[PDB]
A paper describes a structure:
A class I chitinase from the carnivorous sundew plant Drosera adelae was successfully expressed in the methylotrophic yeast Pichia pastoris and efficiently purified using a chitin affinity column. Enzymatic activity assays revealed that the enzyme showed a specific activity of 235.3 ± 10.2 U·mg−1. In D. adelae chitinase, a characteristic tyrosine cluster consisting of Tyr174, Tyr199, and Tyr201 formed a unique structural feature that enabled recognition of the (GlcNAc)4 substrate. The hevein domain structures further indicated that the tyrosine cluster (Tyr41, Tyr43, Tyr50) in D. adelae chitinase may be involved in hydrogen bonding and CH/π interactions with (GlcNAc)3.
Crystallization of wild‐type and E167Q catalytic mutant chitinases yielded needle‐like microcrystals. X‐ray diffraction experiments were performed, and high‐resolution datasets were obtained at 1.73 Å and 1.57 Å, respectively. Structural analysis of diffraction data revealed that only the catalytic domain could be resolved in both crystal forms.
Numbering used by the authors: 79 to 321
Write the structure that this text describes.
Amino acid sequence: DVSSIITSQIFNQMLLHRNDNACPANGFYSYQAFINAARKFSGFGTTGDTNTRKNELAAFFGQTSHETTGGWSTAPDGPYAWGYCFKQQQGNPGDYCVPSSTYPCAPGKKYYGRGPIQISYNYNYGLCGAAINQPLLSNPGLVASDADISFETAIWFWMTPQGNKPSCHAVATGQWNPSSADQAAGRVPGYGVITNIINGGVECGQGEKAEVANRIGFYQRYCSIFGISPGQNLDCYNQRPFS
Protein backbone atom coordinates (compact mmCIF):
# COMPACT_ATOMS: atom_id res chain seq x y z
CA ASP A 1 0.00 0.00 0.00
CA VAL A 2 1.27 3.51 -0.89
CA SER A 3 0.43 4.73 2.68
CA SER A 4 3.20 2.39 4.04
CA ILE A 5 5.78 4.60 2.14
CA ILE A 6 4.22 8.11 2.41
CA THR A 7 2.56 8.99 5.76
CA SER A 8 0.46 12.13 6.55
CA GLN A 9 3.58 13.62 8.27
CA ILE A 10 5.86 13.03 5.19
CA PHE A 11 3.07 14.52 2.93
CA ASN A 12 2.59 17.57 5.23
CA GLN A 13 6.33 18.16 5.88
CA MET A 14 6.98 18.12 2.09
CA LEU A 15 3.96 20.46 1.40
CA LEU A 16 4.65 22.58 4.52
CA HIS A 17 3.29 26.03 3.42
CA ARG A 18 0.52 24.85 1.01
CA ASN A 19 -2.17 25.83 3.58
CA ASP A 20 -0.81 29.33 4.47
CA ASN A 21 -3.47 32.07 3.89
CA ALA A 22 -1.31 33.38 0.97
CA CYS A 23 -1.97 30.07 -0.94
CA PRO A 24 -5.37 30.22 -2.77
CA ALA A 25 -5.78 26.36 -2.67
CA ASN A 26 -5.36 26.30 1.20
CA GLY A 27 -7.25 23.29 2.64
CA PHE A 28 -7.91 21.69 -0.79
CA TYR A 29 -5.05 19.15 -1.06
CA SER A 30 -5.62 16.64 1.80
CA TYR A 31 -3.47 13.54 2.47
CA GLN A 32 -6.72 11.46 2.40
CA ALA A 33 -7.57 12.69 -1.12
CA PHE A 34 -4.05 11.82 -2.32
CA ILE A 35 -4.21 8.29 -0.82
CA ASN A 36 -7.77 7.68 -2.17
CA ALA A 37 -6.52 8.62 -5.68
CA ALA A 38 -3.11 6.87 -5.49
CA ARG A 39 -4.69 3.49 -4.49
CA LYS A 40 -6.63 3.55 -7.82
CA PHE A 41 -3.37 3.30 -9.87
CA SER A 42 -1.76 -0.13 -9.26
CA GLY A 43 2.04 0.18 -9.10
CA PHE A 44 2.01 3.91 -8.23
CA GLY A 45 4.43 4.18 -5.26
CA THR A 46 4.20 0.32 -4.87
CA THR A 47 6.74 -0.73 -7.60
CA GLY A 48 10.25 -2.01 -6.79
CA ASP A 49 12.05 -1.92 -3.42
CA THR A 50 11.29 0.71 -0.72
CA ASN A 51 14.00 3.08 -2.16
CA THR A 52 12.33 2.81 -5.62
CA ARG A 53 8.85 3.48 -4.11
CA LYS A 54 10.18 6.48 -2.15
CA ASN A 55 12.03 7.76 -5.26
CA GLU A 56 8.82 7.58 -7.36
CA LEU A 57 6.83 9.56 -4.71
CA ALA A 58 9.75 12.02 -4.34
CA ALA A 59 9.81 12.54 -8.17
CA PHE A 60 6.00 12.75 -8.43
CA PHE A 61 5.72 15.39 -5.62
CA GLY A 62 8.84 17.13 -7.01
CA GLN A 63 7.26 17.71 -10.45
CA THR A 64 3.69 18.45 -9.28
CA SER A 65 5.12 20.85 -6.59
CA HIS A 66 6.77 22.79 -9.48
CA GLU A 67 3.46 22.96 -11.45
CA THR A 68 1.67 24.36 -8.35
CA THR A 69 4.42 26.34 -6.53
CA GLY A 70 3.66 29.63 -4.70
CA GLY A 71 7.38 29.92 -3.80
CA TRP A 72 9.70 32.95 -4.17
CA SER A 73 13.40 33.77 -3.52
CA THR A 74 12.77 34.91 0.13
CA ALA A 75 9.98 32.44 1.05
CA PRO A 76 9.96 30.90 4.55
CA ASP A 77 11.78 27.47 4.69
CA GLY A 78 13.01 28.04 1.07
CA PRO A 79 11.07 28.09 -2.25
CA TYR A 80 10.98 24.18 -2.17
CA ALA A 81 8.53 24.30 0.82
CA TRP A 82 5.79 26.10 -1.22
CA GLY A 83 4.56 23.23 -3.45
CA TYR A 84 0.77 22.80 -4.01
CA CYS A 85 -0.03 26.47 -3.26
CA PHE A 86 -2.32 26.64 -6.39
CA LYS A 87 -4.99 24.37 -7.92
CA GLN A 88 -5.91 26.60 -10.97
CA GLN A 89 -3.62 28.33 -13.54
CA GLN A 90 -2.76 31.94 -12.48
CA GLY A 91 -3.18 35.03 -14.72
CA ASN A 92 -6.48 35.31 -16.63
CA PRO A 93 -5.85 32.13 -18.71
CA GLY A 94 -8.11 31.62 -21.75
CA ASP A 95 -10.24 28.58 -22.60
CA TYR A 96 -7.36 26.28 -23.77
CA CYS A 97 -9.76 25.14 -26.51
CA VAL A 98 -8.09 23.43 -29.54
CA PRO A 99 -11.02 22.03 -31.56
CA SER A 100 -11.17 18.21 -31.73
CA SER A 101 -13.73 16.00 -33.55
CA THR A 102 -12.76 13.42 -30.79
CA TYR A 103 -12.86 15.69 -27.63
CA PRO A 104 -14.87 18.85 -28.41
CA CYS A 105 -14.63 22.11 -26.36
CA ALA A 106 -17.84 22.13 -24.25
CA PRO A 107 -19.39 25.60 -24.81
CA GLY A 108 -18.58 28.04 -21.95
CA LYS A 109 -15.99 25.62 -20.41
CA LYS A 110 -12.25 26.35 -19.96
CA TYR A 111 -9.38 23.77 -20.03
CA TYR A 112 -6.65 25.91 -18.43
CA GLY A 113 -4.22 24.25 -15.98
CA ARG A 114 -5.86 22.53 -12.95
CA GLY A 115 -4.59 20.34 -10.12
CA PRO A 116 -1.14 18.95 -9.36
CA ILE A 117 0.06 18.40 -12.98
CA GLN A 118 -1.80 21.48 -14.31
CA ILE A 119 -3.66 19.31 -16.85
CA SER A 120 -4.49 21.58 -19.83
CA TYR A 121 -6.46 21.55 -23.14
CA ASN A 122 -9.65 19.72 -24.10
CA TYR A 123 -7.57 16.82 -25.61
CA ASN A 124 -6.02 16.02 -22.19
CA TYR A 125 -9.19 16.54 -20.15
CA GLY A 126 -10.93 14.24 -22.66
CA LEU A 127 -8.21 11.55 -22.74
CA CYS A 128 -7.84 11.54 -18.90
CA GLY A 129 -11.64 11.65 -18.32
CA ALA A 130 -12.02 8.55 -20.55
CA ALA A 131 -9.17 6.80 -18.65
CA ILE A 132 -10.40 7.60 -15.03
CA ASN A 133 -14.17 7.46 -15.92
CA GLN A 134 -14.86 11.14 -14.93
CA PRO A 135 -16.75 13.72 -17.06
CA LEU A 136 -13.78 16.12 -17.31
CA LEU A 137 -14.55 17.28 -20.90
CA SER A 138 -18.05 18.42 -19.89
CA ASN A 139 -17.04 19.50 -16.32
CA PRO A 140 -13.30 20.34 -16.37
CA GLY A 141 -13.88 22.31 -13.11
CA LEU A 142 -14.04 18.94 -11.24
CA VAL A 143 -10.20 18.93 -11.39
CA ALA A 144 -10.14 22.08 -9.10
CA SER A 145 -13.38 21.38 -7.05
CA ASP A 146 -12.71 17.71 -6.11
CA ALA A 147 -9.28 16.84 -4.56
CA ASP A 148 -9.55 13.06 -5.29
CA ILE A 149 -10.25 13.84 -8.97
CA SER A 150 -7.49 16.53 -8.90
CA PHE A 151 -4.89 13.93 -7.69
CA GLU A 152 -6.32 11.29 -10.11
CA THR A 153 -5.57 13.59 -13.14
CA ALA A 154 -1.95 14.02 -12.03
CA ILE A 155 -1.36 10.28 -11.32
CA TRP A 156 -3.13 9.37 -14.62
CA PHE A 157 -0.66 11.65 -16.42
CA TRP A 158 2.27 10.18 -14.45
CA MET A 159 1.32 6.56 -15.27
CA THR A 160 0.45 7.02 -19.01
CA PRO A 161 2.89 6.69 -21.95
CA GLN A 162 1.98 9.01 -24.91
CA GLY A 163 3.53 8.96 -28.42
CA ASN A 164 7.35 8.85 -28.18
CA LYS A 165 7.26 9.52 -24.36
CA PRO A 166 7.42 6.70 -21.79
CA SER A 167 5.32 7.11 -18.60
CA CYS A 168 6.96 9.20 -15.84
CA HIS A 169 6.27 6.01 -13.77
CA ALA A 170 8.54 3.86 -15.98
CA VAL A 171 11.37 6.46 -15.70
CA ALA A 172 10.90 6.95 -11.91
CA THR A 173 10.93 3.16 -11.22
CA GLY A 174 14.04 2.52 -13.41
CA GLN A 175 12.02 0.58 -16.02
CA TRP A 176 12.80 2.93 -18.99
CA ASN A 177 15.55 2.26 -21.57
CA PRO A 178 16.27 4.99 -24.16
CA SER A 179 15.67 4.11 -27.86
CA SER A 180 18.29 5.01 -30.52
CA ALA A 181 16.22 8.24 -31.08
CA ASP A 182 16.39 9.02 -27.31
CA GLN A 183 20.17 8.29 -27.18
CA ALA A 184 20.77 10.65 -30.19
CA ALA A 185 18.63 13.26 -28.35
CA GLY A 186 20.81 12.76 -25.19
CA ARG A 187 17.68 11.69 -23.22
CA VAL A 188 19.25 9.64 -20.36
CA PRO A 189 17.39 7.85 -17.51
CA GLY A 190 16.90 10.24 -14.57
CA TYR A 191 14.69 13.09 -13.27
CA GLY A 192 15.70 15.32 -16.25
CA VAL A 193 13.85 13.09 -18.73
CA ILE A 194 10.77 13.25 -16.42
CA THR A 195 10.93 17.07 -16.78
CA ASN A 196 11.22 16.54 -20.56
CA ILE A 197 8.07 14.32 -20.60
CA ILE A 198 6.12 17.01 -18.68
CA ASN A 199 7.27 20.22 -20.47
CA GLY A 200 10.50 19.54 -22.44
CA GLY A 201 9.33 21.41 -25.54
CA VAL A 202 9.61 24.64 -23.44
CA GLU A 203 12.21 23.76 -20.78
CA CYS A 204 14.72 21.22 -22.18
CA GLY A 205 17.72 21.24 -24.57
CA GLN A 206 18.43 25.00 -24.10
CA GLY A 207 21.00 24.83 -21.27
CA GLU A 208 20.60 26.07 -17.67
CA LYS A 209 16.93 27.16 -17.09
CA ALA A 210 15.10 28.39 -13.91
CA GLU A 211 12.00 26.14 -14.29
CA VAL A 212 14.16 22.94 -14.58
CA ALA A 213 16.30 23.95 -11.54
CA ASN A 214 13.05 24.57 -9.55
CA ARG A 215 11.77 21.06 -10.37
CA ILE A 216 15.17 19.71 -9.22
CA GLY A 217 15.12 21.79 -5.95
CA PHE A 218 11.77 20.22 -4.95
CA TYR A 219 12.98 16.63 -5.81
CA GLN A 220 16.27 17.04 -3.80
CA ARG A 221 14.34 18.32 -0.74
CA TYR A 222 11.83 15.44 -0.95
CA CYS A 223 14.61 12.79 -1.53
CA SER A 224 16.13 14.04 1.78
CA ILE A 225 12.71 13.97 3.63
CA PHE A 226 12.39 10.32 2.31
CA GLY A 227 16.07 9.67 3.30
CA ILE A 228 17.11 8.55 -0.24
CA SER A 229 19.70 9.89 -2.73
CA PRO A 230 18.40 11.72 -5.86
CA GLY A 231 20.64 9.85 -8.36
CA GLN A 232 21.99 11.37 -11.59
CA ASN A 233 20.87 13.18 -14.76
CA LEU A 234 18.66 15.53 -12.72
CA ASP A 235 18.47 18.15 -15.52
CA CYS A 236 17.35 18.12 -19.19
CA TYR A 237 19.67 21.03 -20.17
CA ASN A 238 21.37 18.98 -22.97
CA GLN A 239 18.29 16.89 -23.89
CA ARG A 240 16.39 17.48 -27.16
CA PRO A 241 12.63 17.81 -26.35
CA PHE A 242 10.33 14.87 -27.29
CA SER A 243 7.98 17.29 -29.17
